[PDB]
Amino acid sequence: YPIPTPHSGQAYDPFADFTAKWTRANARQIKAQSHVPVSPDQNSLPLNLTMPDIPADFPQTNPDVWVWDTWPLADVHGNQLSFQGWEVIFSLTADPHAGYVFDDRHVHARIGFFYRKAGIPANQRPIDGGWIYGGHLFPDGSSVKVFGNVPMTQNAEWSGGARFVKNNNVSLYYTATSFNRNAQGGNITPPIAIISRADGQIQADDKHVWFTGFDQHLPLLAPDGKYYQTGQQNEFFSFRDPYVFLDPAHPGKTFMVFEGNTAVQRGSRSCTEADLGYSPNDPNKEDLNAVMDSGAIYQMANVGLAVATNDELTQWKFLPPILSGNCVNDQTERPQIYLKDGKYYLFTISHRTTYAAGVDGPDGVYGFVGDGIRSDFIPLNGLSGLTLGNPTDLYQPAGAPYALNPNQNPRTFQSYSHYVMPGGLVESFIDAIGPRRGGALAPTVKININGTSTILDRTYGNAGLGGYGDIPANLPA
Ligand SMILES: OC[C@@]1(O)OC[C@@H](O)[C@@H](O)[C@@H]1O
Ligand SMILES: OC[C@@]1(O)OC[C@@H](O)[C@@H](O)[C@@H]1O
Ligand SMILES: OC[C@@]1(O)OC[C@@H](O)[C@@H](O)[C@@H]1O
Ligand SMILES: OC[C@@]1(O)OC[C@@H](O)[C@@H](O)[C@@H]1O
Ligand SMILES: OC[C@H]1O[C@](O)(CO)[C@@H](O)[C@@H]1O
Ligand SMILES: [Mg+2]
Ligand SMILES: [Mg+2]
Ligand SMILES: [Mg+2]
């Protein structure tokens, strides 16, 4: 084994300049823990960290909608709330009958909502989960007003979270994005990404759930280029996915974690020995210059933190990043702070194909534990960071969901956008299963979170697979 970087989990002041590193020594534990698959099996991952195989005959969530990143109606404590006996979810959506292909859908994303009666066991609902599509959440043209008169070919509504909270009772924190692209998908000018808020009112009767409002979109945060990378630093920067929450350790504050990138000009040789994570006397340490020469400098993920500066939560400021993956992976997406047993779990999603040269791991969800929202985070599962991966052979090429390598597991891209719900239930969407593309919710699964390690419960639902899109409420609003 490579020696993993130790971590204390110790808490820091949220305002202090300390960033935990998910080091190359930590991420290399994933391949170290993996085995060459015994043919015809094509999974190298430890069984406890492997998502079960999703059936190829999965249902669509809705035949008229491509659905992907999904979040529940929630509060700032992570509870998932029912409203007047209805369960409610929000999703990124696109139109399968609009002339663009599934892989080009992201610049067309609209936030939609779905609802279903609360309190029905998953195995007694329709196989598709019984979600009723309510349509677009936001009025046409309301989100794009945050950009003003800038050159633009597309605008999208990307992920965040919904908080049940002025007849308005729902705050939608999301990512407004503007693109200025040639017909070949190349950037004419860098994309613009603004973490934004829109308030509205959920209403319901015996027949349906509907929303009013969301007419006024407030820009909250755009990257600074000091802590969070800008489009001028890197046209391929990531800045998105606000998760707004209350930390019981800091009463009176409201915090947000989100996805960013380290704020350097693209191609800067800025990785350090601390990003590699080896002892100076470790005879098997990697060489910093060799790692940067291999191209690892193009992988610069971070998880950002921001705090509200007014009572209405309409003004925010950045704090230093809480986690960085420099020279490890470019993507730490949809971060969430999950509170359990007085500990702070940071869960974030990533891709196999956005790992740096010399490091490898599956598509899925990554996890870290500490004693505060700013911690020397302990990567879960043998100091690796992997929580749950799609079945994957890390000893053969990754391929792509639009071009599966037949030397690779045809379910390596079966699910993405894993979101950890109360009780360790995990919801996600289906990307590719063999030749079939999803845009539908995946079976909900269950992880048992036990201090610094996790286990996929293979007796949950049918052999580890629960209901398609089972995203249940634990408390009534
Ligand atoms: O060495 C770091 C540390 O122990 O220093 C004292 C305090 O600032 C703590 O928050 C912090 O974790
Ligand atoms: O059971 C083996 C398999 O190849 O059978 C046909 C399809 O259902 C596939 O998804 C499945 O993996
Ligand atoms: O939605 C899944 C995904 O793999 O689709 C293609 C790209 O847009 C990626 O950023 C994205 O994570
Ligand atoms: O890559 C060097 C580094 O100093 O860049 C800023 C932060 O991401 C730190 O965690 C990181 O170690
Ligand atoms: O779907 C739009 C974008 O947001 C994410 O889903 C979550 O960060 C990314 O994977 C994708 O590029
Ligand atoms: Mg319209
Ligand atoms: Mg790779
Ligand atoms: Mg083969």
Side-chain angles (χ1 to χ4, degrees), residues 68-69 92 105-106 109 158-159 240-241 259 331 333-334 349 351 416-417 429:
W68 65 112
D69 296 6
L92 305 191
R105 72 189 186 280
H106 303 81
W158 282 3
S159 302
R240 48 178 177 269
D241 307 339
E259 172 181 11
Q331 309 306 132
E333 319 194 308
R334 297 194 66 197
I349 64 178
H351 286 295
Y416 196 66
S417 212
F429 82 90

Side-chain angles (χ1 to χ4, degrees), residues 54-127:
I54 297 168
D57 70 344
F58 63 85
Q60 294 301 303
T61 299
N62 187 285
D64 295 321
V65 194
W66 282 325
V67 176
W68 65 112
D69 296 6
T70 295
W71 57 94
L73 183 62
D75 66 16
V76 292
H77 309 288
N79 299 124
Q80 302 186 177
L81 298 182
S82 61
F83 182 78
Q84 286 293 281
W86 298 100
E87 284 178 352
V88 180
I89 60 166
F90 305 88
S91 306
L92 305 191
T93 68
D95 171 18
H97 319 295
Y100 51 84
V101 298
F102 182 67
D103 283 306
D104 293 343
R105 72 189 186 280
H106 303 81
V107 298
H108 305 284
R110 291 288 297 276
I111 295 169
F113 73 99
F114 303 78
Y115 58 92
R116 65 186 188 182
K117 285 288 195 207
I120 304 168
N123 44 43
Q124 293 177 38
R125 297 188 183 274
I127 187 52

Side-chain angles (χ1 to χ4, degrees), residues 10-347:
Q10 76 194 258
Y12 288 79
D13 189 325
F15 288 81
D17 194 10
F18 175 86
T19 302
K21 301 101 174 69
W22 179 34
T23 73
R24 290 180 63 98
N26 293 131
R28 284 176 67 207
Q29 300 308 300
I30 300 169
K31 182 90 180 260
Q33 288 171 209
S34 294
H35 63 275
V36 176
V38 174
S39 288
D41 188 72
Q42 287 185 300
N43 181 38
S44 67
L45 302 178
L47 184 64
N48 289 349
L49 306 185
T50 303
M51 186 176 192
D53 284 6
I54 297 168
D57 70 344
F58 63 85
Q60 294 301 303
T61 299
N62 187 285
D64 295 321
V65 194
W66 282 325
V67 176
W68 65 112
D69 296 6
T70 295
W71 57 94
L73 183 62
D75 66 16
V76 292
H77 309 288
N79 299 124
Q80 302 186 177
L81 298 182
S82 61
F83 182 78
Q84 286 293 281
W86 298 100
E87 284 178 352
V88 180
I89 60 166
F90 305 88
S91 306
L92 305 191
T93 68
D95 171 18
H97 319 295
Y100 51 84
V101 298
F102 182 67
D103 283 306
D104 293 343
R105 72 189 186 280
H106 303 81
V107 298
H108 305 284
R110 291 288 297 276
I111 295 169
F113 73 99
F114 303 78
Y115 58 92
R116 65 186 188 182
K117 285 288 195 207
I120 304 168
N123 44 43
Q124 293 177 38
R125 297 188 183 274
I127 187 52
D128 65 4
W131 294 108
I132 303 157
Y133 176 49
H136 302 320
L137 186 68
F138 297 156
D140 291 4
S142 61
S143 179
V144 74
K145 291 178 183 182
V146 301
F147 300 108
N149 277 63
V150 296
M152 146 171 21
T153 54
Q154 286 92 28
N155 77 284
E157 305 162 3
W158 282 3
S159 302
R163 299 297 178 256
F164 189 85
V165 290
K166 221 250 212 278
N167 41 6
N168 291 326
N169 55 11
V170 178
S171 292
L172 208 296
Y173 293 88
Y174 77 103
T175 318
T177 55
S178 178
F179 309 88
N180 186 208
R181 288 190 172 160
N182 61 40
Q184 299 176 355
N187 296 308
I188 299 168
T189 51
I192 309 162
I194 304 174
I195 287 172
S196 304
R197 171 179 162 183
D199 295 341
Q201 191 186 160
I202 189 170
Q203 306 193 40
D205 64 15
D206 55 351
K207 289 288 173 198
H208 60 157
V209 173
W210 71 98
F211 287 84
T212 60
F214 306 114
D215 300 292
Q216 279 275 94
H217 292 239
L218 192 56
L220 306 180
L221 294 166
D224 62 319
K226 171 188 186 178
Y227 297 133
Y228 306 103
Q229 196 178 52
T230 69
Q232 287 70 45
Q233 286 168 322
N234 173 17
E235 66 175 298
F236 305 113
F237 77 115
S238 297
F239 182 86
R240 48 178 177 269
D241 307 339
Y243 181 89
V244 169
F245 69 102
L246 255 52
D247 179 356
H250 303 278
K253 302 298 212 171
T254 305
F255 288 100
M256 178 197 292
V257 291
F258 58 89
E259 172 181 11
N261 281 124
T262 301
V264 297
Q265 192 71 16
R266 188 181 182 76
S268 298
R269 293 180 62 90
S270 56
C271 292
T272 68
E273 287 296 354
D275 300 325
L276 268 57
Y278 305 100
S279 169
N281 307 146
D282 178 351
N284 296 147
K285 68 180 187 285
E286 301 182 276
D287 179 84
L288 175 61
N289 280 323
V291 166
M292 294 204 278
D293 287 351
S294 76
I297 60 174
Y298 295 108
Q299 283 74 46
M300 299 249 161
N302 73 15
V303 175
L305 185 68
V307 65
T309 61
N310 65 9
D311 291 351
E312 291 225 282
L313 314 181
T314 57
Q315 295 188 330
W316 292 75
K317 67 180 202 94
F318 290 129
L319 300 177
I322 59 166
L323 188 74
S324 62
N326 301 344
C327 280
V328 174
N329 196 299
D330 205 35
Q331 309 306 132
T332 49
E333 319 194 308
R334 297 194 66 197
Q336 59 181 123
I337 293 294
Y338 181 93
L339 303 185
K340 178 176 186 291
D341 300 333
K343 299 299 188 195
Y344 292 74
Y345 288 84
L346 172 59
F347 293 115

Side-chain angles (χ1 to χ4, degrees), residues 352-353 355-356 359-360:
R352 177 160 191 210
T353 61
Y355 274 100
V359 187
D360 206 0

